[PDB]
């Protein structure tokens, strides 16, 4: 394990572990516990072609 | 982001942005916008076990 | 390809190529042909949010 979720998902401004903000889904994430980044999107968008596309 | 789609998907010989060739899907890709490589297959084939397998 | 399945999945104690043990799947992995690791889980668990979650 040389890579962590820090290079794919980053903790949101408030809902990085709560899953919600102010009672509603955070503008960046919605109950995920972080947010997607350039790498995460590449590793997700690419897999979205062989998994969901 | 320290990694790009270049280490997973490479532009096809002709259909790297068109998604098709001569009205027909490229022998390597079929409207994807690139092609899969050894790394892409490992990162896709491995996820195909926890997503599609 | 600069990465292999060795940084995501490793051969199990017995069912790394058999896919089964004593007539039953390995306690650590099922007829998969290996086992999940910390990296594989991160690359799978993260994709499990954009693919299965
Ligand atoms: Zn958020
Ligand atoms: Zn092609
Ligand atoms: Zn096993």
From TrEMBL, chains A, B, C:
Domain of life, source organism: Bacteria
Pfam families per record: Anti-TRAP (PF15777)
Protein name as it appears in the record: Anti-TRAP regulator
Gene name of the encoded protein: rtpA
């Amino acid at each position: 394990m040389v890579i962590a979720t820090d290079d794919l998902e980053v903790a949101c401004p408030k809902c990085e572990r709560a899953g919600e903000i102010e009672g509603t889904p955070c503008p960046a994430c919605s109950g995920k516990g972080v947010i997607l980044t350039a790498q995460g999107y590449t590793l997700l968008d690419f897999i979205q072609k062989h998994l969901n596309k």
